[PDB]
Amino acid sequence: MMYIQVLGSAAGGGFPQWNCNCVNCKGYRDGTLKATARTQSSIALSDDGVHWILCNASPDIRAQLQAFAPMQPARALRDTGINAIVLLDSQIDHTTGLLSLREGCPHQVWCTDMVHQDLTTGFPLFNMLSHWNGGLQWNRIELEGSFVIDACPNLKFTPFPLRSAAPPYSPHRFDPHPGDNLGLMVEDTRTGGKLFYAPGLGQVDEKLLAMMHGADCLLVDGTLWEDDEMQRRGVGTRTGREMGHLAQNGPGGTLEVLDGFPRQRKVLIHINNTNPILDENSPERAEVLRRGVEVAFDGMSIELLEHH
Amino acid sequence: MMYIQVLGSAAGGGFPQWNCNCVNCKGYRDGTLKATARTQSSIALSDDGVHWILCNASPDIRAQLQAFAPMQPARALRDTGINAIVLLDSQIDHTTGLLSLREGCPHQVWCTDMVHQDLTTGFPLFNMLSHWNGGLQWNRIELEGSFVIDACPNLKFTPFPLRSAAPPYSPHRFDPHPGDNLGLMVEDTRTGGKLFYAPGLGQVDEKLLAMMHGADCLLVDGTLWEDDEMQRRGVGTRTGREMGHLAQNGPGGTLEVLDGFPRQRKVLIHINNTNPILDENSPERAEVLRRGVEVAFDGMSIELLEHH
Ligand SMILES: [Zn+2]
Ligand SMILES: [Zn+2]
Ligand SMILES: [Zn+2]
Ligand SMILES: [Zn+2]
């Protein structure tokens, strides 16, 4: 059994976003909209429900941990369910949470060389946290092969490279390198059950579709419904392509991509506050569910039992 | 009228603390203890209830803003009640919140030279955030005199130096300098009403007591009940003196110090998860209230009407 817990299901900024008054955010606050608040994207993985691997440490980590009981096993006066942390990129909304874990150092942190570079220079979390009882102990994620974290020895992680898009603070933001971003394939080696986790997906190719067809659950980028969604809401100018996010709708959208995966479980995650699928009464929500695709929410539990 | 909003009232780690199972934290989670959850220390100030000055940006800032309606005036599709931010030190639990405000840059940030140094080197928030639409615009807090933030032109801030204790990440942590920590005197220049804000107070002297007697509301360090409180709970070794916090109890404690201030309003803030005054049925809580001292809580509103 592979346990997948959705701690946070929103894109950066959360839902509602602190400074946003778009139709969703303002409608939520006014109570005129049927939607559920969401923290910034993070999931927890486990092969026993007791030892947990964190994927991305969101700025909302304190509320996310508190909301999920297994994160506090209470086996001693100081204790936690986090046995390791995996970073998919060096972005601020995926790493800031580590600062809130300073009281429980050391932590094993798995990330690529490029991400380790960013996090020892432009956002030197490793340098900062090292003053707290050994800080973060780096474990290198290689750009080939797989890795196993001893706390969950039945989980086999196979990372795959995504289009390099280093954070704006990154010394090499204008110089993208392989290792800047990745998606995860996670396999329960006892059953064969595979999770495909790609919260940040800007493009698909043949190699990608091939490994998706080998997976049992598809947990993918659901940031924007339309590529110019920020313009439509009137709260920004950046497109989904500029942000490295494939929209759900239109030709080449994820919904069209997901049509070739009828047998896989399909869940949209990392959803922006502007996305209509957050409105549970939207025709966009209805279309998603009509296509057999789920919309992730904070507290969602995905059980991965076996392999197709 | 001076409005003071308590966004967060706990010391670092919050209450409950993510990794802590002391009598308070575990008792809260079990529901066997009568206590209220608290986010990490931060207050908001205003002279009109519309424009707000943030003091310290806690890691819990997203939940703190969402919980206080004036933080979202909803005057445009993107908007906020934060018009300026004041930092009292460069500690992680007082500055991390700034990262969560990247979507609404630029922000005016007021802090001392020493704090600006830390935040451009060991924790280079200013360097990181500058890639977000102008980032943080530094306004120097001088170690003498006062300053006025134009958004709240009736609020006069007079900072006062506290014992220098630079954060562990700080290049000059072993070399403390004046400007590392300060407390605030805030005056409504229309009424004369003064707030004394010293969330981090490790020692008192004659100069300190003299300016406290000139204030109307005393909002001070309430981290530990006892100096060896971390040892008593069994969750650490550090003392309140090692942490730069004066305990409430015993000779020289804050309660004894506050006895010489019968006319002032007295509120304890920045309270550690281990502190018995969090237990609303504790004899420690009872003693505090018996001495005319209040225990701050998340969402507390303090109205400063006039001067004694
Ligand atoms: Zn994100
Ligand atoms: Zn919005
Ligand atoms: Zn603090
Ligand atoms: Zn505790």
DSSP states of B94-144 = GTGGGGGGGGG--EEEEE-HHHHHHTTTTS-HHHHHTTTTT-EEEEEPPSS
> Residue B41 gets which letter from DSSP?
P
* Contact assessment for residue A55 and residue A45, using Cβ atoms and an 8 Å cutoff: yes
SS3 B219: strand
SS3 B255: helix
For residues A145 and A172, give the distance between their C-alpha atoms in angstroms, rounded to a whole number.
25
Asked if A131's CB is within 8 angstroms of B169's CB, the reply is yes
For residues A141 and B267, give the distance between their C-alpha atoms in angstroms, rounded to a whole number.
49
Token look-up 């096993």 returns: A73
**Strand A52-55 to strand A107-111: parallel, antiparallel, or no bridges (unpaired)?**
unpaired
- Give yes or no for A79 touching B (CB within 8 A): yes
Asked if B26's CB is within 8 angstroms of A61's CB, the reply is no
Tokens of A19: 């400074």
**Strand A217-221 to strand A265-269: parallel, antiparallel, or no bridges (unpaired)?**
parallel
Q: How many domains does chain B have?
A: 1
**Strand A147-148 to strand A155-161: parallel, antiparallel, or no bridges (unpaired)?**
antiparallel
Tokens of B39: 């986010």
CA Rg, chain B, in Å?
Answer: 18
* Chain B residues within an 8 Å CB radius of A234: 77
Tokens of A91: 């972005």
- Give yes or no for A210 touching B (CB within 8 A): no
Which of A71, A76, A233 has the CB atom closest to B21's CB atom? Answer: A76
Alpha-carbon distances, residue A63 vs A39, A86, B55 (angstroms): 8, 19, 22
Q: How far is B195 from chain A (nearest CA, A)?
A: 28
* Contact assessment for residue A156 and residue A127, using Cβ atoms and an 8 Å cutoff: no
- Phi then psi for residue B64, to 5 deg, are -65, -40
Asked if B18's CB is within 8 angstroms of A79's CB, the reply is no
Please name the amino acid found at residue A268. Answer: L
Residue B263: alpha-carbon gap to chain centroid: 22
Nearest residue on chain A to B25, judged by CA atoms? A77
Asked if A128's CB is within 8 angstroms of B128's CB, the reply is no
* Chain A residues within an 8 Å CB radius of B13: 103
- Give yes or no for A96 touching B (CB within 8 A): yes
Token look-up 């990330």 returns: A111
* Contact assessment for residue B204 and residue B257, using Cβ atoms and an 8 Å cutoff: yes
Three-class secondary structure assignment of chain A: CEEEEEEECECCCCECCCCECCHHHHHHHHCCCCCCCECECEEEEECCCCCEEEECCCCCHHHHHHHCHHHCCCCCCECCCEEEEECCCCCHHHCHHHHHHHHHCCEEEEECHHHHHHCCCCCCHHHHHCCCCCCEEEEECCCCCCEECCCCCCEEEEEEECCCCCCCCCCCCCCCCCCCCEEEEEEECCCCCEEEEECCCCCCCHHHHHHHCCCCEEEEECCCCCCCHHHHHCCCCCCCCCCCCCCCCCCCCHHHHHCCCCCCEEEEECECCCCHHHCCCCHHHHHHHHCCEEECCCCCEEEECCCC
**Closest residue by Cα to residue A304 from A185, A224, A211:** A185
Which of the ligands is closest to the CA of residue B94?
Answer: 3
* Contact assessment for residue B10 and residue B275, using Cβ atoms and an 8 Å cutoff: no
Query: Which strand (E) or helix (H) includes residue B158?
Result: strand B155-161
- Locate the DSSP E strands across B20-99: 42-46, 52-55, 82-86
Measure the CA dihedral B246/B249/B254/B257, to 10°. Answer: -130
**Closest residue by Cα to residue B295 from B304, B305, B308, B282:** B282
For residues B97 and B107, give the distance between their C-alpha atoms in angstroms, rounded to a whole number.
12
* Contact assessment for residue A29 and residue A19, using Cβ atoms and an 8 Å cutoff: no
Domain that holds residue A236: 1-308
- Give yes or no for B105 touching A (CB within 8 A): no
Final resolution, Å: 2.5
Please name the amino acid found at residue A199. Answer: P
Longest pairwise C-alpha distance within chain B: 54
For residues A25 and A23, give the distance between their C-alpha atoms in angstroms, rounded to a whole number.
6
Please name the amino acid found at residue B3. Answer: Y
* Contact assessment for residue B300 and residue B41, using Cβ atoms and an 8 Å cutoff: no
* Chain B residues within an 8 Å CB radius of A102: 92
For residues A292 and A290, give the distance between their C-alpha atoms in angstroms, rounded to a whole number.
5
Check which CATH number belongs to the domain holding A37 and give it.
Answer: 3.60.15.10
Q: Where are the alpha helices (DSSP H) in chain B?
A: 23-30, 61-67, 113-118, 125-129, 206-212, 229-233, 254-258, 283-290
* Contact assessment for residue A44 and residue A80, using Cβ atoms and an 8 Å cutoff: no
Asked if B71's CB is within 8 angstroms of A18's CB, the reply is yes
For residues A220 and A128, give the distance between their C-alpha atoms in angstroms, rounded to a whole number.
32
Q: How many helices (H) and strands (E) does chain B have?
A: 8, 14
SS3 B86: strand
Token look-up 């957050």 returns: A278
Tokens of B202: 């490790």
**Peptide bond before residue B16 is cis, with ω within 30 degrees of 0:** yes
> Which positions 126-185 of B are in contact with A (Cβ < 8 Å)?
127-128, 131-132, 168-169, 173
- Phi then psi for residue A12, to 5 deg, are -55, 140
* Contact assessment for residue B218 and residue B266, using Cβ atoms and an 8 Å cutoff: yes
Which bin fits A222, alpha (ψ -120 to 50), beta or left (φ > 0)? alpha
> Which positions 271-300 of B are in contact with A (Cβ < 8 Å)?
none
**Peptide bond before residue B124 is cis, with ω within 30 degrees of 0:** no
For residues A228 and A225, give the distance between their C-alpha atoms in angstroms, rounded to a whole number.
9
* Chain A residues within an 8 Å CB radius of B21: 72, 74, 76-79
**Closest residue by Cα to residue B270 from B162, B191, B193:** B162
Token look-up 């005056």 returns: B187
Tokens of A61: 């980590």
For residues A177 and A161, give the distance between their C-alpha atoms in angstroms, rounded to a whole number.
10
**Closest residue by Cα to residue B150 from B226, B83, B65:** B83
Output b/e per residue, A14-27; b: 16+ Cβ within 10 A.
bbbbbbbbbbbbbb
Token look-up 């086996």 returns: A75
Please name the amino acid found at residue A126. Answer: F
Q: How far is A210 from chain B (nearest CA, A)?
A: 37
**Closest residue by Cα to residue B269 from B183, B192, B208:** B183
Tokens of B151: 């958004």
For residues A193 and A1, give the distance between their C-alpha atoms in angstroms, rounded to a whole number.
8
Q: How far is A128 from chain B (nearest CA, A)?
A: 5
SS3 B164: coil
**Peptide bond before residue B262 is cis, with ω within 30 degrees of 0:** no
* Contact assessment for residue A131 and residue A103, using Cβ atoms and an 8 Å cutoff: no
For residues B258 and B264, give the distance between their C-alpha atoms in angstroms, rounded to a whole number.
9
**Peptide bond before residue B106 is cis, with ω within 30 degrees of 0:** yes
For the beta sheet containing A301-304, the strands, ordered from the edge strand earlier in sequence to the opposite edge, are A136-140, A107-111, A82-86, A52-55, A42-46, A2-8, A301-304
Say how many C-beta atoms besides its own lie within 10 A of residue B146's C-beta: 13
Q: How far is A197 from chain B (nearest CA, A)?
A: 25
* Contact assessment for residue A45 and residue A7, using Cβ atoms and an 8 Å cutoff: no
Tokens of A15: 């839902």
Asked if B62's CB is within 8 angstroms of A59's CB, the reply is yes
Q: How was this structure determined?
A: X-ray
Nearest residue on chain B to A81, judged by CA atoms? B19
- Give yes or no for A194 touching B (CB within 8 A): no
Say how many C-beta atoms besides its own lie within 10 A of residue A202's C-beta: 18
* Contact assessment for residue A128 and residue B91, using Cβ atoms and an 8 Å cutoff: no
* Contact assessment for residue B274 and residue B229, using Cβ atoms and an 8 Å cutoff: yes
> Residue B271 gets which letter from DSSP?
B
- Give yes or no for B20 touching A (CB within 8 A): yes
Overall size of chain A counted in residues? 308
